[PDB]
Design a protein around this ligand. Structure first.
Ligand SMILES: CC(=O)SCCNC(=O)CCNC(=O)[C@H](O)C(C)(C)COP(=O)(O)OP(=O)(O)OC[C@H]1O[C@@H](n2cnc3c(N)ncnc32)[C@H](O)[C@@H]1OP(=O)(O)O
Length: 210
């Protein structure tokens, strides 16, 4: 028995406490790097909350057992000056993750796929408490976003997945791949950076039109 609720500003600390327990330690890239204390990821996670489209799964006792943090993304302006997220980061491990994200964006722009769309929903952080996994909570979090999308005329939900494991979950939920890159092929300075276990494979950007 759990509820799916909009994350409020006063929920920030509780969301961060939950993420520190699970996501910071068990996202495949975070665990590969042994991220440790990372105020940069805390900042990254809190950023989308004021967009009012992030959701928490809450058990009967009132504890957060899952979150899907989402933000609105807008088509780059005609006069856009693109920035690398990695430039303003002092945490060497998180900088590797941000550099990977920057690289993906250099190679693939979701807005090229959907020329008529100005605003797309971006699924930024998805995490479920270990003891509540395999119960469909990820799907129920995701489905709550469809409500927001309907209410606001948003057609596309975009989710960068850090492993084939999570991409498979999104596939089950009706998303399809729009871009992929193997970790073995990511060599920004000529050498492999990420070498997690073979089943992870690489990143996949997943999309659904709702
Ligand atoms: C944008 C981003 O954040 S990408 C990164 C996504 N987040 C992570 O990788 C963090 C670590 N992983 C997690 O927190 C979770 O595994 C999630 C969020 C990916 C999935 O959440 P869940 O609510 O468990 O999803 P779901 O119920 O669909 O289970 C997914 C699969 O996990 C497997 N599974 C079954 N039981 C368990 C369990 N006890 N523990 C873990 N996995 C299980 C199954 O393969 C299951 O698929 P199936 O039910 O269709 O057969």
């Amino acid at each position: 028995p759990y509820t799916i609720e909009l994350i409020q500003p006063e929920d920030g600390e509780a969301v961060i406490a939950m993420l520190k327990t699970f996501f910071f330690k068990d996202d495949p890239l975070n665990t590969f790097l042994d991220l440790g204390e990372c105020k940069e990821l805390e900042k990254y996670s809190l950023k989308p909350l004021p967009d009012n489209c992030s959701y928490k799964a809450v058990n009967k006792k009132g504890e957060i057992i899952g979150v899907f943090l989402n933000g609105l993304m807008r088509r780059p302006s005609p006069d856009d000056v693109p920035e690398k997220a990695a430039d303003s980061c002092e945490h060497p491990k998180f900088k590797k993750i941000l550099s990977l994200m920057d690289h993906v964006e250099e190679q693939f722009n979701i807005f090229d796929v959907y020329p008529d769309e100005e605003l797309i929903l971006d699924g930024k952080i998805l995490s479920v408490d270990t003891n509540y996994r395999g119960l469909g909570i990820a799907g129920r979090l995701t489905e709550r976003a469809y409500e927001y999308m309907r209410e606001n005329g948003i057609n596309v939900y975009h989710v960068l997945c850090s492993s084939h494991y999570s991409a498979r979950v999104m596939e089950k939920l009706g998303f399809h791949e729009v871009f992929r890159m193997q970790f073995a092929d990511y060599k920004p300075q000529g050498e492999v950076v990420f070498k997690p276990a073979a089943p992870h494979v690489g990143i996949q950007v997943m999309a659904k039109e709702v």
